[PDB]
Amino acid sequence: QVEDDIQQLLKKINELTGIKESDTGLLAADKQTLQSEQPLQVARCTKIINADSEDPKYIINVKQFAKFVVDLSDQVAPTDIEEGMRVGVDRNKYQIHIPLPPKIDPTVTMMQVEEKPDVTYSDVGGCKEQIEKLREVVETPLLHPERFVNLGIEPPKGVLLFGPPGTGKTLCARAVANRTDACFIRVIGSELVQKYVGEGARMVRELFEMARTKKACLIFFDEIDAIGGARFDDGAGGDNEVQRTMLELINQLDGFDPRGNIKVLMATNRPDTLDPALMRPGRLDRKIEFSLPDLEGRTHIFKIHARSMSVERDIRFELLARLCPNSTGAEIRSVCTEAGMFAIRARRKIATEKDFLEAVNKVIKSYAKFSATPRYMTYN
Amino acid sequence: ENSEKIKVNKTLPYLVSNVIELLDVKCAVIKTSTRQTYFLPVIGLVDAEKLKP
Amino acid sequence: DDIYKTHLENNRFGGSGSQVDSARMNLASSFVNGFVNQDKLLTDDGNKWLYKNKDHGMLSAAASLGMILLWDVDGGLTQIDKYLYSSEDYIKSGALLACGIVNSGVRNECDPALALLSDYVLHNSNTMRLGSIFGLGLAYAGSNREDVLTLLLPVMGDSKSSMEVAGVTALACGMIAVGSCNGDVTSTILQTIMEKSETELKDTYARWLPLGLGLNHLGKGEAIEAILAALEVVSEPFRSFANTLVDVCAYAGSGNVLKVQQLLHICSEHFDSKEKEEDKDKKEKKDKDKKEAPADMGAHQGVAVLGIALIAMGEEIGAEMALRTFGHLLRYGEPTLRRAVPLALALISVSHDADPEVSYNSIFAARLAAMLRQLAQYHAKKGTLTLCPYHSDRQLMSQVAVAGLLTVLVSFL
Ligand SMILES: Nc1ncnc2c1ncn2[C@@H]1O[C@H](COP(=O)(O)OP(=O)(O)OP(O)(O)=S)[C@@H](O)[C@H]1O
């Protein structure tokens, strides 16, 4: 009341007090500058075919209009007007002014990440060797090109990941994407499936355009089974456009002037229908895999999901881990959350051991008819 | 003569085109890059040997 | 325990300490490297880096070994002792400045500097007077220390053409005098009023003397000293700017909106520097009810006013509305205001953090702007002690001689 009425009086006193400046002072924040931008130029952009000899004498296809032979203006450099270069050309006299970056196909612009999702390395504990190897590949050359040069090696420019579903692949990728420091570029595997023939090829072209422009970047591939796994050939002509997309992914990855400062991470759920051209190292070098957390892994993942929740700390966690022999971290998360939900049945602020036992026999033994991994452990 | 060919050739935008055929009643037929077919009775500053459709 | 629980790497020494060269940006980088504090490594990184350095930056680098180590009392003497009494005036004067930086309870560094101070016009020990009167202002806050102020009587009576003599006189005796018993109008600051109005020259004097005046006015609860200095002082807008400085400092903040509508009217004054400090009082006044602190100062046009709001965000934790104001304040073209944005921008945050920094790399890529960017990088990585030195910073549009004292806004642990 007193805070409310006094804050209303003070804030509206400042408001109605500046109202004197509002009704007394009589956009223009740029108006004179914008009218000095009226002697500027419309500057239509184009595409260059070739140059001529002894003179500039440049040749240009605009985009649709025609093709013209032009000359350069005086405020240009006679060097960086090379072929296949989107340059801004005068509308009246048809003269080249500024070279620019090329066409990027803007539906490919929206897969750079532009943010950082907050996932810390602490969330994948119990997978120490995998974290170690993937750290060794991804983090270390971008932050320390010291051991890799003074000993004279090349780090493995590609790492694939696999395992059963829900094992931490996506989560490890996001953990890298927190501490990446590079131009991390997401690619869903279904992004390369378009209506028209050979269009996903051009998407891969533009991906590696962006990759070669910006040095020291990361590209993440995700569920590469849609991108293409096998070249089953019959008298039907079936899955073929996907196959050409996969081949164009092969060649512009690694071979005949290799890739540069780019690292590719792939992640699949079923690494078994893959053409062994991808299985050739030099493209996909380290086969890092995620098995199930055996015994102590689930203790540690209980420590992960349990460290910031309202429980009774007098209980143990090892007995909880001993009842989950073939289980993923997702099922662990469901156990923790569902034990909380059983605590919401009553009105308590701390869990009990019986709540977690209800959670175990609620998740595992009940929904074990679905359970997602009796037919992916065999990697069908 | 150089004054006139300065007044023509200093027009630096050259619309490029394609010679469609070559009449002789020494007469060349042009389709420009805007796809407009043009006739001309007078060829200009190129030789009929160097031309082909 | 700072060394123990934290583990800070080396690629910002090398990378952020690699940001090129030019004896300014490089000089600033020394400062940036220096305020790194995982050991006092950038302190003991060899030689030939301070030999590239020049006079007031040599003050900044001689004090920078003070800045790396605001502890290690026994180590302070044995690290600064090489740079004590050296061949260079700026090495020795910035060295005693560093001795004033590192601690506040030693008081045995006084006498090697204290003894030398007198020069009677403009010799060496007046620059040791700048670092040592200032660093001794860093050193002690007594009931009223009077012996150091009896030393300060031949300082203002000395009155070197170097600004920061009277600068650290007013600021240092103010650091002695902040928290006075409802202030005082005593013969110390009364003497610097009369000896201030003695010489009307180099208006930075007419700005930084009302600094220490208003610092002695701090400690007020009910002080009529604005009326007393209003009777003694006011004149042509140098001393009416002194009037607005006492008007700023005497009015820390309460429910007292009558001076906020006074702020509304005299905010429209045609002299546009009493606008600067008088509107700059806002972050002192309404610092607790900070939801009203967003104002339309950016919607105004007296570009120093956009500077004032740019101050008024400052350094606390800095919510999304503040960084949203740094959306527009980040993009401006004048080099003192584009210089003015990364300082409080990276004070208010002590990718995310480095995202506006690389955005400033997108802004420029002048030399000032590069320096501003370096300052922002340094920032990236009612207690009166944090209230004084940025109002000491508020005359930044000036020489690097002024920026030789820029590293005396010691407000962080
Ligand atoms: N080893 C683990 N430790 C801790 N949490 C885990 C672990 N594995 C999975 N989780 C949690 O369960 C979620 C599911 O893992 P994800 O990697 O997202 O699954 P996935 O990679 O999408 O598997 P798919 O379906 O084959 S793509 C993670 O985001 C974590 O929240």
Explain this structure.
This is part of a larger assembly, with chains A (380 residues), B (53 residues) and C (413 residues). Chain A has 380 residues and is α/β, with parallel strands linked by helices. Chain A has 12 helices and 11 strands. Chain B is α+β, with helices and mostly antiparallel strands. Chain C has 413 residues and is mostly helical. The longest helix of chain C is centred in the middle third of the chain and has 15 residues, at 163-177. Chain C is globular and about 55 Å long. Strand 4 (67-72) of chain A pairs antiparallel with strand 1 of chain B. The complex binds phosphothiophosphoric acid-adenylate ester (AGS). The site of phosphothiophosphoric acid-adenylate ester has 19 residues of chain A, from helix 5, helix 9 and helix 11. Residues 123-124, 126-127, 165-171, 269, 293, 301, 304, 328-330, 333 of chain A line the site of phosphothiophosphoric acid-adenylate ester. Chain A: One of its GO terms (molecular function) is ATP hydrolysis activity. Chain A: Belongs to the AAA ATPase family. Chain A: It comes from Homo sapiens (Human).
Secondary-structure blueprint:
The structure is cut from a larger assembly and holds chains A (380 residues), B (53 residues) and C (413 residues).
Chain A: H1 2-24, H2 31-36, E1 44-45, E2 47-50, E3 58-61, E4 67-72, E5 87-89, E6 95-99, H3 128-143, H4 147-150, E7 158-162, H5 169-178, E8 183-188, H6 199-213, E9 217-222, H7 241-251, E10 262-267, H8 276-279, E11 286-289, H9 296-306, H10 318-321, H11 329-345, H12 353-363
Parallel strand pairs in A: 4-6, 7-10, 7-11, 8-9, 9-10
Antiparallel strand pairs in A: 1-5, 2-3, 3-4, 5-6
Helix pairs in contact in A: 6-7, 9-11, 11-12
Chain B: H1 2-9, E1 14-15, E2 17-23, E3 27-32, E4 37-40
Antiparallel strand pairs in B: 2-3, 3-4
Chain C: H1 2-5, H2 11-14, H3 25-34, H4 55-62, H5 64-67, H6 73-80, H7 89-102, H8 110-114, H9 127-139, H10 147-156, H11 163-177, H12 187-198, H13 205-217, H14 225-233, H15 237-249, H16 258-266, H17 274-280, H18 282-285, H19 304-313, H20 320-330, H21 335-338, H22 341-347, H23 355-364, H24 367-380, H25 388-392, H26 400-403
Helix pairs in contact in C: 3-24, 4-7, 6-7, 7-9, 9-11, 10-11, 11-13, 12-13, 13-15, 14-15, 15-17, 17-19, 22-24, 23-24
Residues 123-124, 126-127, 165-171, 269, 293, 301, 304, 328-330, 333 of chain A line the site of phosphothiophosphoric acid-adenylate ester.
